[PDB]
Design a binder for this molecule. Structure first.
Ligand SMILES: O=C(Cc1ccc(-n2nc(C(F)(F)F)c3c2CCCC3)cc1)N1CCCC1
Ligand SMILES: N[C@@H](CCC(=O)O)C(=O)O
Ligand SMILES: N[C@@H](CCC(=O)O)C(=O)O
Ligand SMILES: [Zn+2]
Ligand SMILES: [Zn+2]
Ligand SMILES: [Zn+2]
Ligand SMILES: [Zn+2]
Ligand SMILES: [Zn+2]
Ligand SMILES: [Zn+2]
Lengths: 259, 259
């Protein structure tokens, strides 16, 4: 056996640097839902592991020209990591190049506003121009809009793709900060899981509005045909059935609530 | 190529006999969410197929003594069908013997009451004895209670397992009828998808109460190592991303609403 290299991403409350731990070593530096999940998966599957943060800070997309995968997906595709344990969305284009476990969490695209913003739905956003809106610049949310044939979402993409200045952000934290600083003139499209987390964080000035725009899941990813895929998949189902995933959700979202 | 034998189950609104079609032939007899899903899967995967209703009318469980699988799971395990396209819950014990696609629908165990029943939650059910409650006698809901280590659910199982007369039912329709006829003295534990469907059916006398007790998914099942598994899995993701699964949900639940 060898130590399994885990790629993950700094995304609250999934993986966070513990206060004042920057200069410590190894796995103990990090906390969060995916840190606890990695420990359980590794225990059930009988492996030792090293948590690493994805070098480019991205989830994963294929460049249109170079055909090269970036982010966590790229780390798996090019053999830089053995497994990705992160809020990584199961998508068709990714499933074509890596393997996913059954989902460990359900989510959908959602709208985050600064409280008091006169927006209730995606339709509302699409029918006005005063309030700008965008997504994480690389990720499954952007791709959702890029590919949608649904009238409202196609309209939103036509606006977003050419809006100036760019409505896209490099990180979730950047999108949240942009909502908070924009006096109601920027809304952020992000996954319901993140949105619901931030809604319960100080300064308690954002909220989720409207229903989810889609329904999907996060999965644990391994390189195609990995020795780990089968056991990891069975482990996710065991964690689900043993109530552990619900325990972790309660721990990191609502037990954490500051609002 | 050969005609693919599809096993499914008569369960509204997934697969229903069209009015006055009992004496007709082939696939045209049936309608419902899973009928529409089967047509899309078959189109994307490039196969012809025959819809068949599971002979024993069960979802699938392994007998404790004989070790034999019944229901749709058994039809796959013993080679009687090529694929199951039905509201078949993804579970660990099933995943050990058959393959599941990524989920096509999200659901959780839920409580159905006759309107006016003084029950708001599973905790409420567990803390009283006036109102009886039970599950489908063979299925993932029964197994959930049989295996739970959560205090409230363990208490409920201890009651259900020895209650007389039996609190278990052979079919969802039987559980719904039992709620409707029992003057508030029977509550039925069933999947949220079914519960939400029935809530919108005449005579509009039942309702879903409380949050879901768990979170899981339905998947399309194939025998272990089937030639169809890979393509079916990719097809489910395509249907999800193309908004087709959302379209089918709206079609069979809410466009169907009678209340
Ligand atoms: O498996 C359960 C719930 C759950 C159920 C279903 C999904 N997923 N996951 C997908 C996905 F495969 F990602 F596209 C899709 C769904 C339902 C909607 C169709 C596409 C996702 C999640 N969880 C594990 C622990 C908590 C939630
Ligand atoms: N979970 C997403 C990143 C967040 C987003 O795109 O909103 C992904 O796997 O790409
Ligand atoms: N979907 C369930 C049947 C319904 C239930 O158990 O409530 C199964 O696959 O076993
Ligand atoms: Zn420490
Ligand atoms: Zn465990
Ligand atoms: Zn620009
Ligand atoms: Zn007809
Ligand atoms: Zn299609
Ligand atoms: Zn009895």
């Amino acid at each position: 056996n060898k130590t399994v290299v885990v790629t993950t991403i700094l995304e609250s409350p999934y993986v966070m640097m513990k206060k004042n731990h920057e200069m410590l070593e190894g796995n103990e530096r990090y906390e969060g839902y995916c840190v606890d999940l990695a420990a359980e998966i590794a225990k059930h599957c009988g492996f030792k592991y090293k948590l690493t943060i994805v070098g480019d800070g991205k989830y994963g997309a294929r460049d249109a020209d170079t055909k090269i995968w970036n982010g966590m997906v790229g780390e798996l595709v090019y053999g830089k990591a053995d497994i990705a344990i992160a809020p990584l969305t199961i998508t068709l284009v990714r499933e074509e190049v890596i393997d996913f476990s059954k989902p460990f969490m359900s989510l959908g695209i959602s709208i985050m506003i600064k409280k008091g913003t006169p927006i209730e739905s995606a339709e509302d956003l699409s029918k006005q121009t005063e309030i700008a809106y965008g997504t994480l610049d690389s990720g499954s949310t952007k791709e959702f809009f890029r590919r949608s044939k649904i009238a409202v979402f196609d309209k939103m993409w036509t606006y977003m793709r050419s809006a100036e200045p760019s409505v896209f952000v490099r990180t979730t934290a950047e999108g949240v900060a942009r909502v908070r600083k924009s006096k109601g003139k920027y809304a952020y499209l992000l996954e319901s899981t993140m949105n619901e987390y931030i809604e319960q964080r100080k300064p308690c000035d954002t909220m989720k509005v409207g229903g989810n725009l889609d329904s999907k899941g996060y999965g644990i990813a391994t390189p195609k045909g990995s020795s780990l895929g089968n056991a990891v998949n069975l482990a996710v189902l065991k964690l689900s059935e043993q109530g552990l995933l619900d325990k972790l959700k309660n721990k990191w979202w609502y037990d954490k609530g500051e609002c």
